[PDB]
Design a protein around this ligand. Structure first.
Ligand code: HEM
Ligand code: HEM
Lengths: 214, 219
C-alpha cells in the first residue's frame, strides 16, 4: 500500500518537511518571537497564494485529475484570511497590500500549473491544506498569546476550519481520495516532485520573512 | 544563443558588482578583521561547503552535473574541518552551530541537489569558480592580520593542494559547463540562482559585519 499517492508524497517530501520545521522563521514563530508587523505580512503572503490557489482550484473544480480534491466548503481559506486582513489592517487593508517577492513566484507557479500541468495541482493543495490541518490549532494559540489576540478568533479566523470538525480523520478522507484519482505512476512521481517544489516556495517565503526582521 | 559560461558572468553582473563592495570584504582584502569573527566566517564556510559537496556527491552520475564533479581538486570540507581545528580547537564540532545566514543558504543547497539538480551548477560556479580566483592572497592576508602561520596553518581553505594552474583549471571548467545540454530559460534560470546564490553570501557577509561590530561596540 506504500504505492499510494499519499504514501509516495509523504516519503517523497520528508526531507523538505524537515527543512520547514527547522527553518528559523518557523522556530522563532512557534516561540512567539514574531511581532505584529511580521504577522501582518505573513498573513498577506498567505492570502495571495491561497486566493490564487483557490481561484485555480476553482478553475479545475471539475477536472478528472482534481475533481474530488475540490472542497470549497471544508477547506478554502480566502473567506478566512479576508476577515483576518480586516482585523489587522482594517477595511482599508486592500489599498495597502504587498506580497513578498517569493510569494509572487509562488503564485505565478500556482497559475502556470493552472493550465499547463493540471494533473499536478493536487501537489499544491496537498502541501498547503494538509499542513494546515496538522498543526493549525497550535499556531492559532501561539499567535493569540504573542500578539495578545482574542480567544474568540479575531485575527486568526484563518487557523480555524469552521466546517471541519475532525482534522485527523478528515485528512484520511483526503488521502483516500488522492489515491482514488486515475493516475499513472509516471505522473505521480511528477506530483511528488511538485509537492517538494511547493515546500521550497514556502521555504522562500519563510526565508524572506526572516530577513524582514533585521 | 550563447555559452553558459558567459551568461553567468554577464547575467550575475550586479551580483559580483554588488559583491566587491561589501563592508566585510573591503575590511578583509586589507587586514582589519577580528580573529573570533574570521572564525564565524570559517564556520559559515564549513556548513555551506559540506552541504554543497554532499549534493554534488549525490548528483555525481547525473548527466546534468557529472562533468562538474571534481572532489580531489575543488572540495574544501576536509580542509575547512581543519581550519576550524586551529581556531575553535578540537571538540568544536559539538559546540559550533551553523550561523543563520548560512543555514538558509545551506537548507537551499540540499533542496536543489535533491529536487532541481540542473541548477546545482549555479551554486558550484558561485563558490568554487570563485575560490580559485585570488585565493592564495586571502590566506597570507589573513595570516599577517591575525598573527597566523604564513605557511597557511589553520587556513588550508584558500589552498588547493591538488590543482596545478588555476586559470587553466577554471578555463577547463567553463568548457565543461558549456558542453551541458539543457533548455534556454534553463540557462536563464541557472543564472537567476547564481544571483540568488550571491545574495545568500551577501546576507552572510554583513551578518558577520554586524556580528564583528557587536564585538567592537563592546570595549
Ligand atoms: C514546526 C513546523 C511544523 C511541524 C512541527 C509540523 C508537523 C507536522 C506533523 C506532526 C505532521 C504529521 C501529521 C500526519 O501525518 O497525520 C505534519 C503533516 C504535514 N505537514 Fe507539517 N509541520 C510543520 C510545518 C509544515 C510546513 C511549513 C509545511 C509546508 C508548508 C507542512 C506541510 C505538511 C503536510 C503537507 C503534511 C501532511 C503530510 C501527509 O500526511 O501526507 N508542515 N506536519
Ligand atoms: C573578496 C572580494 C572579491 C574580489 C576582490 C574578487 C575578485 C575576482 C577576480 C579578479 C576574479 C577573476 C575574474 C576571472 O575569473 O577571469 C573573480 C572571479 C570570480 N569571483 Fe570574485 N571576487 C571577490 C568576491 C567574490 C564573491 C563574494 C563571490 C561570490 C561567491 C565571487 C565569485 C567569483 C566567481 C564565480 C568568479 C569566476 C568568474 C569567471 O567566470 O571568470 N567573488 N573574482
Amino acid at each position: 500500500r506504500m504505492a499510494d499517492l499519499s504514501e509516495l508524497l509523504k516519503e517523497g517530501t520528508k526531507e523538505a518537511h524537515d527543512r520547514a520545521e527547522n527553518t528559523q522563521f518557523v522556530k522563532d514563530f512557534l516561540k512567539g518571537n514574531i511581532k505584529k508587523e511580521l504577522f501582518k505580512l505573513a498573513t498577506t503572503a498567505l492570502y495571495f497564494t491561497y486566493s490564487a490557489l483557490e481561484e485555480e482550484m476553482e478553475r479545475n473544480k471539475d477536472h478528472p485529475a482534481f475533481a474530488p480534491l475540490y472542497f470549497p466548503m471544508e477547506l478554502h481559506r480566502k473567506e478566512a484570511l479576508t476577515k483576518d486582513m480586516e482585523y489587522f489592517f482594517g477595511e482599508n487593508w486592500e489599498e495597502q497590500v504587498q506580497a513578498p517577492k517569493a510569494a509572487q513566484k509562488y503564485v505565478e507557479r500556482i497559475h502556470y500549473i493552472g493550465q499547463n500541468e493540471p494533473e499536478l495541482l493536487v501537489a499544491h493543495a496537498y502541501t498547503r491544506y494538509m499542513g494546515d490541518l496538522s498543526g493549525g490549532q497550535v499556531l492559532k494559540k501561539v499567535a493569540q498569546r504573542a500578539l495578545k489576540l482574542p480567544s474568540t478568533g479575531e485575527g486568526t479566523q484563518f487557523y480555524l476550519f469552521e466546517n471541519v470538525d475532525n482534522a485527523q480523520q478528515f485528512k484520511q478522507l483526503y488521502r483516500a481520495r488522492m489515491n482514488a484519482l486515475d493516475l499513472n505512476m509516471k505522473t505521480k512521481e511528477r506530483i511528488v516532485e511538485e509537492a517538494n517544489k511547493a515546500f521550497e516556495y514556502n521555504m522562500q517565503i519563510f526565508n524572506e520573512l526572516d530577513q524582514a526582521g533585521s
